[PDB]
């Protein structure tokens, strides 16, 4: 009964969202600062439990909303659709920066999550292995033979998911609710336990994409529309999957795309 399991997971996610939002103290306002490279020293007076850096981007201009991918608060990465706390500095990250490593890692994690979601919607997972960006291919092992038709179907599903355009809802939740949501797959349970043991507390970041929920570490891409190209190279050995994808504003070319696909096919 996978449909019932997904429905229960979505219900648990909604209940956790309601619990996190109920503690709002009648909408408490704060004065957050922004220390960027352009138009200083602008500031913002947003909320602390609902407002997100996307609101600041909208207040500034649509260019930042269309280009911003990650907001650097106190030097740490954050998502575009995530509530902020503690008034501190604000920054913006794009693909054309001096050190766009955090953006690349977030895009890699988002591509891995999308590949996992497509695999789950095709017809048991294990985790999301963090592969370097230089590897040229995001991996996503899955426990259970694929052919050209299967790869084409996966690519079509990924393209449909991208066209759907859905936001990435994030939540910083403890390990108890994380295990309650994943009380079936032992691999995900062990992954959540390890992630909780790594952090000083049981807090663990989560993600939701419509009817798909998975655990990760760093932030991801807000909207799926930012992923322009997307393909599935091949499958390797429990079974390790591969794939390549390029974001919007960096449209390479058909030749470069085929070359990258051939390089990833390994």
């Amino acid at each position: 009964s996978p449909t019932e399991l997904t429905e229960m997971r979505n219900d648990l996610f909604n209940k956790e969202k309601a619990r996190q939002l109920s503690l709002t103290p009648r909408t408490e306002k704060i004065e957050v600062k922004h220390v960027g490279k352009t138009d200083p020293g602008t500031v913002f007076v947003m909320n602390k439990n609902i407002s997100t850096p996307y609101s600041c981007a909208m207040h500034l201009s649509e260019w930042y909303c269309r280009k911003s991918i990650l907001a650097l608060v106190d030097g740490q990465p954050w998502d575009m659709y995530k509530p902020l706390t503690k008034s501190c500095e604000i920054k913006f990250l794009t693909f054309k920066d001096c050190d766009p490593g955090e953006v690349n890692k977030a895009y890699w994690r988002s591509c891995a999550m999308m590949m996992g979601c497509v695999i789950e919607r095709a017809f048991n997972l294990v985790r999301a292995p963090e592969v370097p960006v230089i590897s040229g291919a995001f991996c996503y092992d899955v426990v259970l033979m694929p052919t050209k038709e299967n790869l084409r179907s996966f690519t079509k599903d990924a393209h449909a998911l991208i066209y759907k355009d859905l936001p990435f809802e994030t939540l910083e939740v403890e390990a108890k609710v994380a295990l309650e949501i994943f009380q079936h797959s032992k691999y995900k349970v062990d992954f959540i336990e390890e992630k909780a043991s790594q952090n000083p507390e049981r807090i663990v970041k989560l993600h939701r994409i419509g009817d798909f929920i998975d655990v990760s570490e760093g932030p991801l891409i807000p909207r799926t529309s930012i992923c322009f190209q997307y393909e599935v190279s091949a499958v390797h050995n429990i079974r390790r999957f591969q794939g390549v994808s390029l974001p919007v504003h960096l449209r390479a070319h058909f030749t470069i795309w085929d070359k990258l696909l051939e390089r990833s096919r390994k």
Binding site: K37, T38, D39, W63, K67, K96
Partner: protein, 108 residues
């Protein structure tokens, strides 16, 4: 040569509304990494260009103040400095031309 029949409002509208005459939309407006003043591709920025123009004008005014009258054009190179900053040991014979100003965050 003279109009035999005045053009109707419909004909005038159809003549002054076709896509060939309408302003063609352009999609060559990016965001300048400096001061974010939305620059255009293959074209320099606006605020940075104005700053460079002002700096060049100030440097030319200083040169004129140091050069004096017209018809000079010495046969020696130039070296611009700022508040403090000991002259470079390599450029010792080159005539130094400066007055009072702080090095900005974009000049070498």
């Amino acid at each position: 040569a003279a109009p035999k029949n005045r053009r109707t409002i419909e004909v005038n509208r159809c003549r002054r509304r076709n896509p060939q005459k309408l302003i063609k939309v352009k999609n060559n407006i990016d965001v300048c990494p400096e001061c974010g003043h939305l620059k255009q591709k293959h074209v320099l920025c606006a605020y940075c260009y104005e700053k460079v123009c002002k700096e060049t004008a100030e440097i030319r005014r200083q040169i004129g103040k140091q050069e004096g009258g017209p018809f000079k054009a010495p046969t020696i190179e130039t070296v611009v400095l700022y508040t403090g900053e000991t002259p470079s040991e390599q450029d010792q014979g080159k005539r130094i031309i400066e007055r009072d100003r702080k090095r900005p965050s974009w000049f070498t």
